[PDB]
Amino acid sequence: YKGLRLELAVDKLVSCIAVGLPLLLISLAFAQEITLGSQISCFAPTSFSWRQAAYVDSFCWAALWLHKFFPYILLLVAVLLYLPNLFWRFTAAPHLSSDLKFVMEELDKCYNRDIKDIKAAPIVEQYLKTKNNSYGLIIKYLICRVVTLIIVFTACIYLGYYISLFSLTDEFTCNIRTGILRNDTALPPLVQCKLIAVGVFRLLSYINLIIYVLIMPFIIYAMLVPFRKTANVLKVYEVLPTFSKTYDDHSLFLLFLEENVSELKSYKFLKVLENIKN
Amino acid sequence: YKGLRLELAVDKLVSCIAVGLPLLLISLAFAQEITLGSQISCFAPTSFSWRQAAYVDSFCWAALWLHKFFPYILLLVAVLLYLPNLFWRFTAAPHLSSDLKFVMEELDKCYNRDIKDIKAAPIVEQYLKTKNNSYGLIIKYLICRVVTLIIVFTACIYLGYYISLFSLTDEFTCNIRTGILRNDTALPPLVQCKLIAVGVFRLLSYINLIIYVLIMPFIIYAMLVPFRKTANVLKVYEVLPTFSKTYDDHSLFLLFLEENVSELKSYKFLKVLENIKN
Amino acid sequence: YKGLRLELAVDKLVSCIAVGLPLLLISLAFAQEITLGSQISCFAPTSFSWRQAAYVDSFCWAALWLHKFFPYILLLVAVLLYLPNLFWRFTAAPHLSSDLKFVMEELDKCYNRDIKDIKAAPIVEQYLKTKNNSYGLIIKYLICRVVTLIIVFTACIYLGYYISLFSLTDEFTCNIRTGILRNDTALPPLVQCKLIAVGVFRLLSYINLIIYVLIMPFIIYAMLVPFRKTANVLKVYEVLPTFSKTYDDHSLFLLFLEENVSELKSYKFLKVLENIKN
Amino acid sequence: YKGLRLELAVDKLVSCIAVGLPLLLISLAFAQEITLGSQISCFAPTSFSWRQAAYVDSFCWAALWLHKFFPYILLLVAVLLYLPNLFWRFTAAPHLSSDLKFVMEELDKCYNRDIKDIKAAPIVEQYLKTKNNSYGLIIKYLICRVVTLIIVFTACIYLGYYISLFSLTDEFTCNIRTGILRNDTALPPLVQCKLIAVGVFRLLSYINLIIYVLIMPFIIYAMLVPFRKTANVLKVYEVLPTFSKTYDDHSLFLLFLEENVSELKSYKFLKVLENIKN
Amino acid sequence: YKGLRLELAVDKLVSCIAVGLPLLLISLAFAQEITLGSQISCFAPTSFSWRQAAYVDSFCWAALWLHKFFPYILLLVAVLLYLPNLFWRFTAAPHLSSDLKFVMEELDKCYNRDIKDIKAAPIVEQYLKTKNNSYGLIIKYLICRVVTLIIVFTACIYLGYYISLFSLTDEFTCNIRTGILRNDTALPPLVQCKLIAVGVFRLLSYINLIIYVLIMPFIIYAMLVPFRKTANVLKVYEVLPTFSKTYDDHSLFLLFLEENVSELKSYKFLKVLENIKN
Amino acid sequence: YKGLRLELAVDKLVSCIAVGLPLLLISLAFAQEITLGSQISCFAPTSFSWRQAAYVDSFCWAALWLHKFFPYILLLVAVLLYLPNLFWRFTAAPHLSSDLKFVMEELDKCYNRDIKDIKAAPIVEQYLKTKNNSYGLIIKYLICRVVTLIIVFTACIYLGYYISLFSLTDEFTCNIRTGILRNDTALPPLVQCKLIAVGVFRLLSYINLIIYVLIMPFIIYAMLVPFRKTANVLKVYEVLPTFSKTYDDHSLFLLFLEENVSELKSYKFLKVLENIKN
Amino acid sequence: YKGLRLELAVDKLVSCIAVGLPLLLISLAFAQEITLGSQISCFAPTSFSWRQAAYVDSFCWAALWLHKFFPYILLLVAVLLYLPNLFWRFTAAPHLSSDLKFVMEELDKCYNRDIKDIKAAPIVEQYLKTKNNSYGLIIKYLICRVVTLIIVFTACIYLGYYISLFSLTDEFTCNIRTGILRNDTALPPLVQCKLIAVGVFRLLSYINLIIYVLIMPFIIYAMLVPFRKTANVLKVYEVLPTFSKTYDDHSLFLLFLEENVSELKSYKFLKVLENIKN
C-alpha cells in the first residue's frame, strides 16, 4: 500500500487550480512592478527638481485602496486556500490511512481464506457498521470544503467589484498642500496623476474571475457526499459466502474506498467472476 | 514493473513541445524586457524635464491591447496546456497502472503454467471482455486531447492575428491633454511614439505559429483511437491452447498494452515460436 | 512505527500559522521596500541639489520609532515563535518517542499472547502507574504553550497600538538646523515630510491582528490538558482478561497515546469486538 | 544490467557538443548584454535631453534583422538540437533496453548450460532472424541523425552568412523624421549610429562555425550503419556447439550489441578460449 | 542505535541561539544597507557637482571605528561561536559514540542473560572503573564550554559599549582640506554629516545584548558537571544479581548515558520491576 | 568493487587544476566587470551631454582585440580542457571497468582455489596475453593526453603574448569622425581613452601562466606510459603454483591494475608471504 | 567500517580554519564593494561633467598594487590551501583505507579465534613489519603539511606587509595629463584622491593575521610525526598469546590506527582485561 491516495481526484485538482493560479498571477504582477519601477506617474510642474517631483508622486500614491492592495489580497487568498488541505492532512489524513489499510487487508485475507476453503473441500461488515453513527470524518471534510467555497466566493466578489470599479477614468486629480505648504502659491492647486498598472490588473482579474467561477460547481458537487455514485464495491464481494443517503462518515469512507480499489488484487478476479455470472 | 509508461510516446512528445516552447519564448521576452527597460519610447518636447517625459511615456503606454498583453497570454497558454496531463495523471493514470499490472502478471502466469503443463506431460480474455462496454477511460482521454487541440488552435488564431495586425506602421500618435491639461498650449497636441519590442515579437510569433501548426496533425491523429495499428499482441499468444472499430476503452487499453510489451518476458519467446511457425 | 507524530494536530497547525504568517508579511514588506526604494519623502526647497535633498530625507528619517522598526519586530516575533517547538523537539521529543514505542509494542504483544492463549486452550498498567507522580513532561509542554501565548499576546498588543497610533496625519514636520547649520537663513525652518509605507503597514497589521486573535483560543484550549476528551483507549482493551483530572504527565501521555492509535493494529479488532459486545 | 548504454559513444559526444556549445555562447552574449546595457549607440545632437536621445537610440535600433536576432536564433538551434535525443529516449529507447537484456540473458544462460553439459558428460539466432525484415528501429534512428544533420547544416549556413554580412562598415545612418516629426528643422536629417556588440558576435560565430564544421563528418559517418565494423561478437560464440550490408535493424541491433559486451561475463572466457584456438 | 544524541539538549539549544541570532541580525543589517545604499550622508555646499559631493561623503566616511565595523564583528562572533561544536564533533564525538554503543549493548546482553538464567533455572562496572582517572573527555568538553562563555561575554561587553557610545549626537563634523586642498577658500572649513544606520543598530544591539545575557546562566550551569542530577540509572540495574563529585570523565560519561536511556529497551522493564519493589 | 578508480591520480589532479583555475579566474573577472560597470573610459570634451560621451566611450571601445576577448578565450580554454575527460568517460571508461572487475575476480578466485587445494591435501595470464597486440585503449588515452597538452600549450602561448603586449602605455588615442561626422569642427580630432581592466588582467595572466607551466611536466610524464614503474603485482602472485617497453595497452592495463590493488584482498596476504620468503 | 576517518582531527580543524576564513573575509569584502560601488574617490574640479570626473576616478584608480589586488590574493590563498587535502584525498587516501580495514579485520579475527580457542580447551605483526622501510605514505603526508605551512607563512608575510604599508596617509595625489592632455591648462596639475576601502581591509588583515599566527604551531606540531604519543594499542593486544623514532610510514600508520580504535570492538574487552591485570 505505497500509493494510497487519501484525496479525491476532483478535490486534488480544485485545490491546485485555486492555489497555483493566484501565485502565478501575483508573480507576473510583481515582475511587472519591478520592471516598471513605480505604480503611479504624476505630472509635476516644470520648476520642480527631481526630489520634489518624487515627493509629489509618492504623496499622491500614499493618499482607491482596492487598487493599491491587489497583490497582497491575492497572496492572502492563495495562502488561505492552501490552509484547508493542510488542516485535512494534519488532522484527518492519518486516521483514514490506517482504516483503509485495515479494510483492504481484511478483504484480501477473506478472499484468500475463501479460496483455500473452496479448493480444499463477518468482520469487515461489522467494522463498516461501527462507522455508521460517528460523524467524525464527515465534519472535518465538510469544514475543508465549506472553507474553500467561502474563500473562493469572497475572492470572486472582490474581483468582480474591482472590474466594476476601475472600468473608466483610472487617472485622478490630487492635491499637494497639506500642512505647512498651504500658504505658498508656487505649488499647483491640483496635479493630474495616472495609475499605470491598472491596465494589466483587469486582465489578471478577468482570468482569476473566469477560472474561479468555473471552479465553484465542482466544490458544490463535492459537498454533496451521499448523492454521488456509491456502493459498487460490496456487490462484487457478495459472491463469497462469507461476505446510503444520510451524512455519516460511512458514506465518506465508502467514497474513499471506491476511489482506490486498485490496491485490492482480489477485486479484479471477483469482477471477472461477476462478469461470468451475468 | 518499474518502467510502466502510462502515456503514448506521441502524446508525451506533443505535450512537452506545446508547453516548453512558450515558456522559453516568454523567458526570452522577459529577459529582453529587463535589458531594454521599457516597452515604449515617446518623443517629448525639449522643454520637458525627466519626470514630465516619463509621464508622457507611461501615459501613452497605458492608453493595441494585443501587443501589451503578449507574454501574459503566452504564459496563460503554457499553463492551460500543462493542465490536461495533470488531469490525466490525477484522474485516470492510477486506475490504469493496476489494470496493466494485472493483465501482465496474468499473461506471465498463464505462460508459465502452460510451460509447466507441457514439460511435465480464460481469465484475461474474460477480463478484456469486461472492458468492452464501459466508456470510462476513452472519455477522460478524449477530453485531454480535445482540450489540448482547442487551446493549441486558439493560440494559433491569436498568433496569426498578431502578425496580421503589427505588420506595418508599428509607431503611433498619442494625445496628452486629458483632464486638467486641456487648456494650456505649452503641451503639444500629438506626440509621436514608438513601440520598441514589436520587432522581436514577430519572430517569437512566427516560431510559435510554425511549430503549433506542425503539432496539430499529431493531435488529430492521436484522437483517432480505433483507426491506429492494433491487435498484434493476442495473435502472438494464441499459440498457447489455454489462450476493433468502436470507441469503447477496450481499444484504448489495447493501445496501452501494445505500447509496453517490453515488460512481458514471455512475449519474446512466443514471438520466436511464432517465427518458427511461419 | 515510522509515522509517530509526537505533536498534537492543533499545536502543529497553531505553530505554522503563528510562524509562517509574519514571514510572508515581512517578505511582502521587504519586496515593497526594494521596489519603492525609500521609506520617506521630504519636500526640499528648490535651491537644493540632489545631495542636499538626500541629506534632508535621510536626516528627517533617522530623527515614531514604532513605524521604522516594523519588519525587525515582526521577524523577531516569528523567530521567537519558532523557538518553542525547537525547545520541545530537542528536550522532550526523544524521551517520548521511546515511551510511545514501548507501550505500543507492549499492547500488541499482550494482544497476541491472549489470542494464542484463547485459540490453544499487567506490565502496561504498572508502567502507566510509574508516570503518575513525575510532572516531567507536563512542565516542558506547559512552558512551550505559555511562551507561545505570551509572545502572541505581546505581538497582538503591539499591532493594536500601531493601528491606534498611525490612524491619522501620518505626515510630519521636521527641522534641519542642528549644529553648524543653526545660523544661515537659506535653510527652511521646517520641512513637511511624508512616511510613504504606512498605508500598507495598516493592512499588514490588520491581517496579523485578526489571525492572531483567532489563534489564541486554541492555545488557551491546548493549555487545558485534563479537561480534554481522554480515556477512550483502555476501555477498548479491558476486553482481554490480562488487561484523570490532575496535571501530572499521565494525562499528557494518554493524550499522546490516543492521538496515534493508528499504529496499533490490535485496536481495530478490539473495537470491532467491542461493537459486538454492545 | 545497471549500466546499459543505449546510445553510441560518438552520437552521445556529438549531441553534447551541438547542444552545450550554443548554450554557453549565448550565456556569454547575454552576460555581455547586461554589462554593456544597450546594443546600439547613436550620436544625438547637442540640444537633445536624455529622453529624446534615448528615443533616437531605441528608434534607430527597432528600425539588419540578422544581427538583432542572434541569441534567439542560437537558443532556437540549441533547443532544436536537444529535441532528437528526447525523441529517441521517449520513442525507441525502452523498446531496445528489453531486447538487449533478453539477448544478453539468453547468451549467458546458453553458455552456462553448455558448461554444465560439458563438465557433466538456437533461440538467439532465431530471435536475431526475427529482426531481419522489420525496419522499425533503423527508421527512428535515421530520423534522429538526419534531423541533427539538417539543423547543424542550417545553423552553419546562417553563421556563414553572418560573417559574410557584418565584415565591414558595421555602423549605419538612420533617419528620425517619420510621421509628425517630418516638418520641423530642429531634428537632424540623418544620425550616425553604431552597433556595439558586433565585435564579439564575429568571434562567437567563428567558434560556432569551426566546431559545427568539425562535427558534421561524424554525423555523416554515424548515418552509415552497415558500413561500420560489425559481426565480431557471434564469431566468438561459435565455439559452443549449441551456438550484413542492408539497412534493416538487425545491423543496428548488432551495433548496439557490440557496443556493450562488457555486461556479458561469458564473453571474456570465450575470447580467451578463442585465443587458445588460434 | 540510529538516534544517538552525543550532545546535551541545553548545550544544543545554547549553540543554535548563540550562532543563529547574529546571522539573522547581520542578514537584516545587510539587507538594510543594500536598500539604503550608503551608510553616511554629508551636507555638501551648493556649488558642488555630484562627484565632489560623493568625494565628501566617502571621505568623511573613511576618516567611531566601532560603528563602521559592526556587521563584520557580529559575523566574526557568529563564526567563532560555531567553531567549538566543530571542535567537539571532530575531536571527541566519535570517541564517545563507540563507548556509548558498547555500554548499551553490554547492558542489554547482561539483562538478556539474566532473564535466560532465571527462566531456565561485572564487565560494565569494571569498564566504568577504567573511566575514573582519565580526564580526557572532560578537558575537551570544558574547553568547548569556556570558549563559548568567553566569546559570549566579550560580545556582550562590545554590545554594551556600543550603546554606551552612540546614545546621543550621532552626527558629527568633518574636515575636508587634507593635502593639496588646504589652500583654497571655496571649500568649507567643516561639513555636518550624519550616520544614517545607527538608529537600527541600537535595536539590533539591544536584542543581541538581552538574549546574550539570558544565555550565559545556562553556560555557567553546563560547566558545573558533577553538581547536576546524576546516578539514577545504575540504581535501576542493581535489581539484577549480576549487576560522584570530582571532575573526571566518569561523571561526564554518566551524564551522556542518562541523557539517552531511550535506546535501552531493558530500562523500561527494570523501571517497572523497580516500581513493583517500592 | 564500489570504489574502482579508472583514472590515474596524477591525471585526475592535472584535469581539475587545468579546468577549475580559468573558471575561478573568469568568475573574478566577471565580478570585477559588474562592479566597475564598463571596461573603457574616454575623455569626452566639456560640451558633450551624457549620451554623446557614452557614444564616444562605446565607439572607441568597439573599434587590441586580445584585451577585449580575454574572458571568452579563457572560458573556451576551460571548456576545451573539460572535453577530454568527457571523451574518456564516454568512450573508454566502461570498457575498462569490466576488464578490471574480471581480472580482480579471477585473481581472488585463483587464490581461494589454491588455498582450498593446499589446506585439503592459467586464465589471467592468457587474458593478459590477449591484450598484447590490440592498441585500442592506448590510442584513446594518448588522444586525451595530447589534446590536453596542446590546449594547455596554446593557452600558455596566448597568455605569454598578452603580457608581451599590454606591458606599457595601455591607454590609446581614438578618432570619432567616421561617416557623417567628418565635416563639423565641434568634435575633437582625437580623444584620449584608457582601458581600465588591464591592471588586473596581468595578474590573472601571470597566475594562469605560472600554474600552466608547472602543469605541463606532469602531462609529458603521463604520456610516457612504458617508462613508468610497472610489473610489481604479478611478482607477488608467482608464489602460487597455478600463477614491458612497447606501447600496446597491456602496459596501460598494468598501470590501471597496479593503481587499484586495494580491492584485491588476497594481495595483502601474498605480500606478507613474500616478506616471509625474503 | 562506515566511519573510517583517514584524517587527523587537528589536521581537519586546521584545513577548515585556513580555507574557510579567507572565503568569508572576501565574501564580506565583495559585499562591501557592491554596496559602496567604487574603490576610489577623486576630487574633480567644478567645471567637469560626470563623464570627465568618472574618467579622472577610473584613471587615478588604474594608475599601491597591494591594495587593489587584495581580494584576488586572498582567494588565491584560499584555493591554494584547499589544494593539499585534494592531493591527499586523490593520491594517498584510498591506499590507506584498505590497509586500515585489513588490519582491523585481522585483529578482530585473531581475538575471536583466541576466544574460541580458550573457551573450547602472527600476521598483523608481519604486516606492520612490511611497512617499516617503505617511506611512501610519510612523503605525501609531509608534502601536504609543508605546502600548507609555506602558503600560510607567505600569506602571513603579505598580510603583515599590508599593515606595514597602509598605516598612514592612505590618500594620494594623482596626475591626469598623460598624452594628448599635456597641453591645455584647463585640467588641474594634481588631483587629491582617496582610497575608500582601506579602512576595512586593515580589520580583515588583522583578523587574518592573528588567526594565521595561531594556526602555525599546530602545523609545526603535526609535522613532528614520531615525537607524538604513539604505541598504546599493541600493548593492549599483547594479552593474547598469539599476539618508534624514525620517519618511515610505520609511525604514520600507527598514528592513523590509534586515531580510530573505535571501530575495533575487541579493544574495549581487552582494555577491561588489562585493567583487571593491573
How many angstroms separate the CA atoms of F156 and F123, rounded? 48
Contacts of D79 in chain B (CB under 8 A): 24
Neighbour-count burial for B75-112, b at 16+ CB within 10 Å, e otherwise: bbbbbbbebbbebbebbbebbbbbbbbbbbebbeebbe
Q: Is there a contact between A204 and A28 (Cβ–Cβ < 8 Å)?
A: yes
| Residue G235 burial (10 A CB sphere; 0-12, 13-18, 19+) | exposed
Beta bridge partners of F221: none
**Distance between G126 CA and the closest CA of chain F, angstroms:** 7
**Residue at grid coordinates 574480471:** F102
Q: Is there a contact between E155 and E77 (Cβ–Cβ < 8 Å)?
A: yes
How many angstroms separate the CA atoms of B174 and B181, rounded? 14
What secondary structure, in 3-state letters, does G149-194 show? Answer: HHHHHHHHHHHHHHHHHCCCCCCEEECCCCCCCCCCCCCCCCEEEE
Residues of G with CB under 8 A from a CB of F: 30, 33-34, 37, 47-52, 54-55, 58-59, 61-62, 65, 68-69, 72, 75-76, 79, 86-87, 90-91, 94-95, 97-99, 102, 123, 126-127, 129-130, 178-181
Of E41, E192, E200, the CB nearest to C180: E192
The C-alpha cell of F262 is what? 586495494
Phi, psi of G41 (to 5 degrees): -145, 115
What secondary structure, in 3-state letters, does chain C show? Answer: CCCCCCCCHHHHHHHHHHHHHHHHHHHHHHHHHHHHCCCEEECCCCCCCHHHHHHHHHHHHCCCHHHHCHHHHHHHHHHHHHHHHHHHHHHCCHHHHHHHHHHHHHHHHHHHHHHHHHCCCCHHHHHHHHCCCCCCHHHHHHHHHHHHHHHHHHHHHHHHHHHHHCCCCCCEEECCCCCCCCCCCCCCCCEEEEECCHHHHHHHHHHHHHHHHHHHHHHHHHHCCCCCCCCCCHHHHCCCCCCCCCCCHHHHHHHHHHCCCCCCCHHHHHHHHHHHCC
Strand, helix or coil for residue B1: coil
How many angstroms separate the CA atoms of B165 and B66, rounded? 9
Q: How many residues are listed for chain F in this entry?
A: 278
Chain B contact partners (≥3 CB pairs within 8 A): A, D
Q: Is there a contact between E88 and E141 (Cβ–Cβ < 8 Å)?
A: yes
Interface with chain F: mutation pick from G51, G58, G70, highest number of F CBs within 10 Å: G51
Strand, helix or coil for residue E6: coil
Give the residue from chain D lying closest to F64, CA to CA: D199
Beta bridge partners of G192: G173
**Distance between F39 CA and the closest CA of chain D, angstroms:** 9
Strand, helix or coil for residue D131: coil
Q: Is G54 close to F41, i.e. CB distance below 8 A?
A: yes
For residue F55, which of D189, D45, E49, D174 has the smallest C-alpha distance? D45
How many angstroms separate the CA atoms of B107 and C234, rounded? 50
Of E72, E76, E130, the CB nearest to G200: E72
Interface with chain G: mutation pick from F19, F59, F262, F271, highest number of G CBs within 10 Å: F262
**Distance between F275 CA and the closest CA of chain D, angstroms:** 33
| Discontinuities in chain C (C→N > 2.5 Å), after residue | 63, 121, 243
Does an H or E element contain B162, and which?
helix B137-165
Bridge pairing between strands D191-195 and G40-42 = unpaired
Phi, psi of G49 (to 5 degrees): -70, 180
The C-alpha cell of D67 is what? 544581427
DSSP state of B179: S
Q: How many residues are listed for chain E in this entry?
A: 278
Q: How many residues are listed for chain G in this entry?
A: 278
Q: Is there a contact between E98 and G263 (Cβ–Cβ < 8 Å)?
A: yes
Residue contacts between D and F (CB atoms, under 8 Å): 99
- At residue A196's C-alpha, the angle toward residues A191 and A201, to 5°, is 140
Interface with chain E: mutation pick from C26, C47, C90, highest number of E CBs within 10 Å: C90
| Residue B207 burial (10 A CB sphere; 0-12, 13-18, 19+) | middle
Does an H or E element contain E71, and which?
helix E70-91
Q: Is there a contact between G56 and F50 (Cβ–Cβ < 8 Å)?
A: no
- Experimental technique used? cryo-EM
- At residue E34's C-alpha, the angle toward residues E32 and E36, to 5°, is 65
- At residue G257's C-alpha, the angle toward residues G255 and G261, to 5°, is 125
Amino acid residing at A163: I
DSSP state of E241: T
For residue E57, which of G37, C205, F159, A170 has the smallest C-alpha distance? G37
**What number of helices (H) and strands (E) belong to chain B?**
11, 3
Q: Is F265 close to G181, i.e. CB distance below 8 A?
A: no
- At residue D194's C-alpha, the angle toward residues D190 and D196, to 5°, is 160
Does an H or E element contain E40, and which?
strand E40-42
Q: Is there a contact between E28 and E75 (Cβ–Cβ < 8 Å)?
A: no
How many angstroms separate the CA atoms of G274 and G267, rounded? 10
Phi, psi of D191 (to 5 degrees): -105, 145
Give the C-alpha distances (Å, rounded to integers) separating D46 from B87, D77, F47: 62, 43, 8
Q: Is there a contact between B28 and D79 (Cβ–Cβ < 8 Å)?
A: no
Neighbours of D133 (CB within 10 A): 10
Give the C-alpha distances (Å, rounded to integers) separating F77 from B201, D239, F74, F148: 36, 50, 5, 10
How many angstroms separate the CA atoms of D105 and D101, rounded? 6
What does the DSSP assignment read for chain A? ------S-HHHHHHHHHHHHHHHHHHHHHHHHHHHH--SEEE---TT--HHHHHHHHHHHH---HHHHTHHHHHHHHHHHHHHHHHHHHHHTSHHHHHHHHHHHHHHHHHHHHHHHHHTT--HHHHHHHHTTS--SHHHHHHHHHHHHHHHHHHHHHHHHHHHHHTTS---EEE----STTSS-SSS-S-EEEEESSHHHHHHHHHHHHHHHHHHHHHHHHHH--TTSS---SHHHHTTSTT---S-SHHHHHHHHHHTT-SS-SHHHHHHHHHHHT-
> Sheet holding A40-42: strands in order across?
A40-42, A191-195, A172-174
Q: Is there a contact between C183 and C88 (Cβ–Cβ < 8 Å)?
A: no
What does the DSSP assignment read for chain F? ------S-HHHHHHHHHHHHHHHHHHHHHHHHHHHH--SEEE---TT--HHHHHHHHHHHH---HHHHTHHHHHHHHHHHHHHHHHHHHHHTSHHHHHHHHHHHHHHHHHHHHHHHHHTT--HHHHHHHHTTS--SHHHHHHHHHHHHHHHHHHHHHHHHHHHHHTTS---EEE----STTSS-SSS-S-EEEEESSHHHHHHHHHHHHHHHHHHHHHHHHHH--TTSS---SHHHHTTSTT---S-SHHHHHHHHHHTT-SS-SHHHHHHHHHHHT-
Of F51, F127, F129, the CB nearest to D44: F51
Q: Cα A86 from chain centroid?
A: 11
Residue contacts between A and B (CB atoms, under 8 Å): 92
Give the C-alpha distances (Å, rounded to integers) separating A145 from A12, A138, D78, E127: 12, 10, 47, 63
Give the residue from chain F lying closest to D274, CA to CA: F130
How many angstroms separate the CA atoms of A269 and B126, rounded? 10
How many angstroms separate the CA atoms of B209 and B201, rounded? 12
Beta bridge partners of C194: C41
For residue D40, which of D24, D17, D59, D65 has the smallest C-alpha distance? D59
DSSP state of B40: E
Rounded to a whole number of angstroms, the CA Rg of chain G reads: 30
Residue ranges with strand state E in chain D: 40-42, 172-174, 191-195
Q: Is E62 close to G204, i.e. CB distance below 8 A?
A: no
For residue D207, which of D8, D2, D28 has the smallest C-alpha distance? D28
For residue E38, which of A33, D3, C55 has the smallest C-alpha distance? C55
The C-alpha cell of A128 is what? 463498516
Strand, helix or coil for residue B41: strand
Phi, psi of B40 (to 5 degrees): -140, 160
Strand, helix or coil for residue B195: strand
Q: Is there a contact between F81 and F152 (Cβ–Cβ < 8 Å)?
A: yes
Does an H or E element contain B45, and which?
none
Residues of D with CB under 8 A from a CB of F: 3, 5, 9, 12-13, 16, 24, 28, 31, 35-36, 41-44, 46, 48, 50, 53-54, 57, 171, 173, 190-192, 194, 196-200, 203-204, 207, 260, 262-263, 265, 268-269, 271-272, 275-276
Residues of E with CB under 8 A from a CB of G: 30, 33-34, 37-38, 47-52, 54-55, 58-59, 61-62, 65, 68-69, 71-72, 75-76, 79, 86-87, 90-91, 94-95, 97-99, 102, 123, 126-127, 129-130, 178-181
Bridge pairing between strands B172-174 and B191-195 = antiparallel
- Which residues have CB under 8 Å from A30's CB, separation 6+? A71, C31
**Distance between F133 CA and the closest CA of chain G, angstroms:** 31
Of G57, G194, G275, the CB nearest to E62: G194
How many angstroms separate the CA atoms of F198 and F39, rounded? 9
Contacts of C126 in chain E (CB under 8 A): 272, 275-276
Q: Cα F154 from chain centroid?
A: 13
Q: Is D24 close to F79, i.e. CB distance below 8 A?
A: yes
Q: Is D94 close to B12, i.e. CB distance below 8 A?
A: no
Q: Is A95 close to C262, i.e. CB distance below 8 A?
A: yes
Interface with chain F: mutation pick from G64, G76, G90, highest number of F CBs within 10 Å: G90
For residue C256, which of C236, C237, C238, C230 has the smallest C-alpha distance? C230
Give the residue from chain D lying closest to B4, CA to CA: D94
Of D62, D76, D94, the CB nearest to B196: D62
Amino acid residing at E97: S
Dihedral sign of CA atoms A191, A196, A201, A203 in order: positive
For residue B81, which of B151, B14, B160 has the smallest C-alpha distance? B151
Mark whether C and B touch (3+ CB pairs within 8 Å).
Answer: no
Of F53, F191, F207, the CB nearest to G76: F207
Give the C-alpha distances (Å, rounded to integers) separating C21 from C17, C74, E27, G23: 6, 10, 20, 35
**Distance between G204 CA and the closest CA of chain E, angstroms:** 9
Listed resolution, Å? 3.4
Contacts of D59 in chain B (CB under 8 A): 41, 194, 196
Strand, helix or coil for residue D196: coil
Q: Is there a contact between F225 and F252 (Cβ–Cβ < 8 Å)?
A: yes
Q: Cα E94 from chain centroid?
A: 21
Helix axes E249-258, E94-118, angle to 10 degrees: 70
Bridge pairing between strands F172-174 and D172-174 = unpaired
Beta bridge partners of D161: none
Contacts of D44 in chain F (CB under 8 A): 49, 51-52, 55
Where are the domains positioned within chain C? 9-276
Q: Is D52 close to B42, i.e. CB distance below 8 A?
A: no
Neighbour-count burial for A132-141, b at 16+ CB within 10 Å, e otherwise: eeeeebbebb
Q: Is there a contact between E138 and E252 (Cβ–Cβ < 8 Å)?
A: yes
Q: Is there a contact between A270 and A237 (Cβ–Cβ < 8 Å)?
A: yes
Give the residue from chain B lying closest to D92, CA to CA: B9
Neighbours of F180 (CB within 10 A): 16
Which CB contacts under 8 angstroms, 24+ apart, belong to F189-192? F190/G180, F191/F42, F191/F43, F191/F44, F191/F56, F191/F60, F191/G180, F192/F42, F192/F43, F192/G178, F192/G179, F192/G180, F192/G181
